[PDB]
């Protein structure tokens, strides 16, 4: 019922109508070239081609029990030959050479799209995945966050390494509760308004000069905000209002220049167990 | 005295022998 | 605060001789341990480590984990022999993990006999890899990739060893004209998109550049024969010893044997079927290659 061909060489799908009712095949590190002769295995729900040489995705109409499904690290240009897998719960898109989001409105039951480093230029055609609650985003070519607002399940938003220059899209994404956009352009702290439910938020590696407009965000659990332009310290009382903030990170700042850099962190943020990299509390 | 870097005898030098070299 | 070494190193063994792609799962707590732990011993050593031979130099792994194993059995496990390797751990056939927690969990508990210097892959961003940090939160979370950053910022970044081999992961920099400007950097710390720091990660030798070039990884410079001939001269040294290019034998030349590519990593993607080297030095700085064949 399961079956690991990992690491196996194997450089063509040939010959696997011999399985009757296989459930997870695994053909990662295989030097695949084409997707073909898989028609037969009509029981598959997941699917794993994790670092082959596939062009192209095709050959995959007839898997409709497939709920995950893995194409990262190949060769892929475009999106295609999706349509049809409507129970596709997480599907894996990584490292790949695809340049639009196109060609996923029938996976309504999608909750996982990973689409990390690509060469992706804007967020379309997502509307129609109302279930999602993990989009990643990271290392791509985005300079605008825009057409997110459907994604009223999403939970984590991972957007770091892009083109941002402003947060702002954000305000229907009421669930979100991770939220990364780490090495970006930001210069403000804006458009969080709606996200009261963020334990999670990282804008470190920015260029960022002052804390605001987060004195609503009383879940924060984690606040990333290393290599900024940070140079006040009264900007901390914005943090104040989350009283089970556990982790800040605020080195590799202008305050970080102040021989009481951690006596002040501790005395603005008394909740805080960990600062950068170190521990405080227990 | 000093301390020098050589090589044992069994190594070859494979720098003009074509060899393939590439940027990850 | 504790951690049982010995049972993480037991574990990260056991899996010798499978078939690559057979995975170990230690406890988050225990991955974050030997991220935290190790960090203490980088940042309690020199940025510029200054080694003594006899040691082995090894080039990248990119988290071929089964690969890893075997440079060690042909090398000899620590602390049998002492290693120095020139970064690039990590990568993405989802066991950059293994290789990591255990070339830490050896820094750990060899820190006197085995190094560990920083590569492009240890970067504290996802601007050009990606791999890693997408394992990390495949298989833990998010988080766990931010405190493996942590570590990664406090690694050194060059050695020499005996005066006369100068190790880096990358090459050399145009802004590099005294050895006290890589002791002055200071931990933690990202790798730039510019400058020393970046180039001794990043940058390249070439044939072709009569001096300094623009590199085609789009980041950092190359450099040719006469820059390593004027840096070994100014620096009174015999060798600049450096990883971070697939070479066909694992190891490679460039100008006259007075710089060496290493690369230990064999058959990178599966599509140049290279090698994987291991350079040996001895008492007397004698240098011999040990070669490990792709298995497949
Ligand atoms: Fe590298």
């Known amino acids: ?265 501790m005395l603005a943020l008394p909740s805080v167990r960990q600062i950068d990299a170190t521990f405080v509390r227990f | 005295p000093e301390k020098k870097v050589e090589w044992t005898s069994d190594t070859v030098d494979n720098e003009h022998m074509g060899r393939r070299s590439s940027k990850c | 605060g504790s951690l049982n070494l010995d049972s993480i190193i037991g574990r990260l063994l ?36 200054e080694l003594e031979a006899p040691l082995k130099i090894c080039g990248d792994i990119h988290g071929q984990y089964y690969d890893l194993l075997r440079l060690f059995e042909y090398g000899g496990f620590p602390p049998e022999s002492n290693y120095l390797f020139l970064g690039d751990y990590v990568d993405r056939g989802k066991q950059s993990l293994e290789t990591i927690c255990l070339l830490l969990a050896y820094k750990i508990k060899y820190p006197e006999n085995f190094f560990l210097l920083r590569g492009n892959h240890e970067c504290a961003s996802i601007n050009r890899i990606y791999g890693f940090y997408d394992e990390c939160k495949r298989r833990y979370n998010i988080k766990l990739w931010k405190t493996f950053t942590d570590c990664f910022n406090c690694l050194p970044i060059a050695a020499i060893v005996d005066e006369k081999i100068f190790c880096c992961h990358g090459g050399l920099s145009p802004d590099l004209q005294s050895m006290e400007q890589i002791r002055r950097i200071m931990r933690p710390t990202d790798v730039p998109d510019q400058g020393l720091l970046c180039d001794l990660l990043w940058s390249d030798p070439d044939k072709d550049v009569q001096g300094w070039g623009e590199n085609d990884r789009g980041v950092s410079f190359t450099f040719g024969a006469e820059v390593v001939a004027k840096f070994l001269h100014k620096h009174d040294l015999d060798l600049i010893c450096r990883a971070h290019q697939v070479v066909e034998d694992g190891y490679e030349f460039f100008a006259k044997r007075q710089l060496v590519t290493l690369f230990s990593a064999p058959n990178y993607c599966g599509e140049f079927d290279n090698a994987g080297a291991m350079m040996s030095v001895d008492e007397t700085l004698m240098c011999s290659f040990q070669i490990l064949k792709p298995a497949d």
Not at chain 1, 131 to 153: H, R
Not at chain 1, 238 to 246: P, Q, T, V
């Open chain 1, 1 to 265: 019922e399961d079956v690991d061909l990992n690491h196996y060489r194997i450089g063509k799908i040939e010959g696997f109508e011999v399985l009757k009712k296989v459930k997870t095949l695994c053909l990662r590190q295989n030097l695949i070239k084409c997707i073909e002769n898989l028609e037969e295995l009509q029981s598959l729900r997941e699917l794993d081609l994790y670092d082959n040489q596939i062009k192209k995705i095709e050959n995959l109409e007839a898997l409709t029990e497939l709920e995950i499904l893995d194409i990262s690290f190949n060769l892929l240009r475009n999106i295609e030959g999706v349509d049809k897998l409507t129970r596709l719960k997480k599907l894996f898109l990584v490292n790949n050479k695809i340049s639009k989001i196109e060609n996923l409105s029938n996976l309504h039951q999608l909750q996982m799209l990973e689409l990390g480093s690509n060469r992706i230029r804007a967020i379309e055609n997502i509307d129609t995945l109302t279930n999602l609650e993990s989009l990643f985003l990271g290392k791509n070519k985005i300079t605008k966050l825009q057409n997110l607002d459907a994604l009223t399940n999403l939970t984590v938003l991972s957007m770091q390494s892009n083109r941002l220059t402003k947060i702002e899209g954000l305000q229907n994404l009421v669930n979100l509760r991770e939220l990364y956009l780490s090495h970006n352009g930001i210069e403000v702290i804006e458009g969080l308004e709606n996200n009261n439910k963020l334990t999670m938020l990282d804008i470190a590696s920015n260029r960022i000069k002052k804390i605001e407009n987060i004195s609503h965000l009383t879940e924060l659990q984690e606040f990333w905000m290393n290599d900024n332009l940070l140079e006040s310290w009264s900007d901390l009382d914005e943090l104040k209002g989350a009283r089970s903030l556990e982790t800040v990170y605020l080195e590799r700042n202008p305050l970080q220049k102040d021989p009481q850099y951690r006596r002040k962190v």
């Open chain 3, 14 to 49: 056991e899996v010798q001789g499978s078939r690559p792609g057979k995975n170990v799962q230690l406890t988050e707590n225990e991955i974050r341990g030997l991220c935290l732990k190790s960090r203490e011993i980088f940042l309690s050593q020199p940025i510029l480590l």
